[PDB]
Design an enzyme around this catalytic site. Structure first.
Site, PDB file in Angstrom:
ATOM      1  N   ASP A 172       0.818  -1.207   0.000  1.00  0.00           N
ATOM      2  CA  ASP A 172       0.000   0.000   0.000  1.00  0.00           C
ATOM      3  C   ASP A 172       0.853   1.259   0.000  1.00  0.00           C
ATOM      4  OD1 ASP A 172      -2.754   0.994  -0.133  1.00  0.00           O
ATOM      5  OD2 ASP A 172      -2.444   1.792   1.892  1.00  0.00           O
ATOM      6  N   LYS A 177       1.791   4.828  -1.577  1.00  0.00           N
ATOM      7  CA  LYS A 177       1.174   5.910  -2.327  1.00  0.00           C
ATOM      8  C   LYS A 177       1.621   7.195  -1.674  1.00  0.00           C
ATOM      9  CE  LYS A 177      -2.671   4.360  -0.601  1.00  0.00           C
ATOM     10  NZ  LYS A 177      -1.764   3.422  -1.343  1.00  0.00           N
ATOM     11  N   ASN A 220       0.959   8.159   1.875  1.00  0.00           N
ATOM     12  CA  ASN A 220       1.341   7.145   2.856  1.00  0.00           C
ATOM     13  C   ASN A 220       2.762   7.388   3.351  1.00  0.00           C
ATOM     14  OD1 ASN A 220      -0.679   5.166   3.506  1.00  0.00           O
ATOM     15  ND2 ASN A 220      -0.612   4.533   1.348  1.00  0.00           N
TER      16      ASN A 220
HETATM   17  C1  LIG Z   1      -3.765  10.808   3.647  1.00  0.00           C
HETATM   18  N1  LIG Z   1      -3.335  10.487   4.997  1.00  0.00           N
HETATM   19  C2  LIG Z   1      -2.940  11.574   5.894  1.00  0.00           C
HETATM   20  C3  LIG Z   1      -3.352   9.039   5.319  1.00  0.00           C
HETATM   21  C4  LIG Z   1      -2.921   8.724   6.750  1.00  0.00           C
HETATM   22  C5  LIG Z   1      -1.870   7.625   6.667  1.00  0.00           C
HETATM   23  N2  LIG Z   1      -1.446   7.252   8.024  1.00  0.00           N
HETATM   24  C6  LIG Z   1      -0.639   8.039   8.805  1.00  0.00           C
HETATM   25  C7  LIG Z   1      -0.478   7.360  10.006  1.00  0.00           C
HETATM   26  C8  LIG Z   1       0.380   7.968  11.125  1.00  0.00           C
HETATM   27  C9  LIG Z   1       0.493   9.352  11.671  1.00  0.00           C
HETATM   28  C10 LIG Z   1      -0.214  10.650  11.293  1.00  0.00           C
HETATM   29  C11 LIG Z   1       0.494  11.856  11.350  1.00  0.00           C
HETATM   30  N3  LIG Z   1      -0.385  12.803  10.949  1.00  0.00           N
HETATM   31  C12 LIG Z   1      -1.610  12.262  10.637  1.00  0.00           C
HETATM   32  C13 LIG Z   1      -2.842  12.845  10.167  1.00  0.00           C
HETATM   33  C14 LIG Z   1      -3.965  11.989   9.928  1.00  0.00           C
HETATM   34  C15 LIG Z   1      -3.909  10.590  10.141  1.00  0.00           C
HETATM   35  C16 LIG Z   1      -2.699  10.020  10.603  1.00  0.00           C
HETATM   36  C17 LIG Z   1      -1.559  10.863  10.846  1.00  0.00           C
HETATM   37  C18 LIG Z   1       1.532   9.202  12.739  1.00  0.00           C
HETATM   38  O1  LIG Z   1       1.971  10.133  13.484  1.00  0.00           O
HETATM   39  N4  LIG Z   1       2.006   7.976  12.874  1.00  0.00           N
HETATM   40  C19 LIG Z   1       1.364   7.231  11.957  1.00  0.00           C
HETATM   41  O2  LIG Z   1       1.608   5.982  11.833  1.00  0.00           O
HETATM   42  C20 LIG Z   1      -1.182   6.152   9.969  1.00  0.00           C
HETATM   43  C21 LIG Z   1      -1.363   5.083  10.905  1.00  0.00           C
HETATM   44  C22 LIG Z   1      -2.165   3.963  10.526  1.00  0.00           C
HETATM   45  C23 LIG Z   1      -2.773   3.922   9.231  1.00  0.00           C
HETATM   46  C24 LIG Z   1      -2.588   4.982   8.323  1.00  0.00           C
HETATM   47  C25 LIG Z   1      -1.789   6.116   8.676  1.00  0.00           C
END
Ligand SMILES: CN(C)CCCn1cc(C2=C(c3c[nH]c4ccccc34)C(=O)NC2=O)c2ccccc21
Length: 312
Positions: free
Chosen positions: A130, A132, A135
């Site tokens: 996954d 992209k 991510n």
């Molecule tokens: C388009 N976006 C922002 C997709 C969010 C992708 N993503 C970021 C995170 C993480 C973080 C994020 C850091 N900023 C964020 C804003 C919105 C959602 C997640 C986060 C983080 O600090 N540590 C993470 O692993 C995450 C965790 C589990 C599944 C998906 C995750």
């Protein structure tokens, strides 16, 4: 642990499956982004694997510099949680929209750190699957960090091959579309794309979406910018070779060495960057009560051992 010892400071990400809170452990006073999944959403034997796998991976990204760590995992009657390492640079998806195209150099620096990340993954028998732009988040001062593990493939010795048709469409690899079995190769195709997107600012493929899209990917000979560099292109060609075999990094027992070897990565000192010794080209709330009407109907059985605190 438990919700108790946490200060649910904010909601930073809303999904159907999960919510990503911006929480802080009182004891340590340190911060972690916690992932909240309604238990009522992971019912049936094919959903515990979606979790156990996210868990099994998170029980590994802790050891790598460009992979998000897992502080701890706890549940409740209504849900499941993930105290995860926190990131605040944003996702390249945003960084891109705010800049269009990336200088071949910058682009190179990122693609590198990711390969390293993907490499560690593969070496551990994992297929990210996954990848992209949104991510790949940004480290406080630059370094990338692969996120989301709800599509990876567990344990697997090289030479092995799985076949679950999945992944975010725009990046889905051609052999996946061909419904043929696959492996680590699909992860390099994605990278190939992520890279095209950064340098070209555009996507490499373009009735109906998927319908059409998938055909582009499988026949549409990708158009490289006539401004692009020779090296730059080459890599793109290499990674976007529709043939898993003839594809960069996909060659067995040599893959990563190949990648590193490629001209596009000419002055790159991997062991140095693998340690973040290289300079980044760019430095950057209470939950709903439980509805007994629903909770009372939960198995709770298929939820054992979920708890786990990372000792390191
Ligand atoms: C388009 N976006 C922002 C997709 C969010 C992708 N993503 C970021 C995170 C993480 C973080 C994020 C850091 N900023 C964020 C804003 C919105 C959602 C997640 C986060 C983080 O600090 N540590 C993470 O692993 C995450 C965790 C589990 C599944 C998906 C995750």
């Amino acid at each position: 642990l438990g919700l108790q010892d946490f200060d649910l400071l904010r909601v930073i990400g809303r999904g159907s499956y999960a919510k990503v809170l911006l929480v802080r452990l009182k004891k340590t006073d340190r911060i972690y982004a916690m992932k909240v999944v309604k238990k009522e959403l992971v019912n049936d034997d094919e959903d515990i694997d979606w979790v156990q796998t996210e868990k099994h991976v998170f029980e590994q990204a802790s050891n790598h510099p460009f992979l998000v760590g897992l502080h701890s995992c706890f549940q409740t009657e209504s849900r499941l949680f993930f105290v995860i390492e926190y990131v605040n640079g944003g996702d390249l998806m945003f960084h891109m929209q705010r800049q269009r195209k990336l200088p071949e150099e910058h682009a190179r620096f990122y693609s590198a750190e990711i390969s390293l990340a993907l490499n560690y993954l593969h070496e551990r028998g994992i297929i990210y699957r996954d990848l992209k732009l949104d991510n790949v988040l940004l480290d406080s001062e630059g370094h990338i960090k692969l996120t989301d593990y709800g599509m990876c493939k567990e344990g697997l010795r090289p030479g092995d091959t799985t076949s679950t048709f999945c992944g975010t469409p725009n990046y889905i690899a051609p052999e996946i579309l061909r419904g043929e079995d696959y492996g680590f190769s699909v992860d390099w195709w994605a990278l190939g794309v992520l890279m095209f997107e950064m340098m070209a600012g555009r996507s490499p493929f373009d009735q109906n979406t998927e319908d059409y899209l998938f055909q582009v990917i499988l026949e549409k000979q990708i158009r490289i910018p006539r401004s692009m560099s020779v090296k730059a292109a080459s890599v793109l060609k290499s990674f976007l070779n529709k043939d898993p075999k003839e594809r960069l990094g996909c060659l067995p027992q040599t893959g990563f060495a190949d990648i590193q070897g490629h001209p596009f990565f000419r002055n790159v000192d991997w062991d140095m960057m693998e340690q973040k010794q290289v300079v980044p080209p760019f430095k950057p709330v209470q939950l709903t009560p439980d509805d007994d009407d629903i909770v009372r109907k939960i198995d709770q059985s298929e939820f054992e051992g979920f708890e786990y605190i990372n000792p390191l």
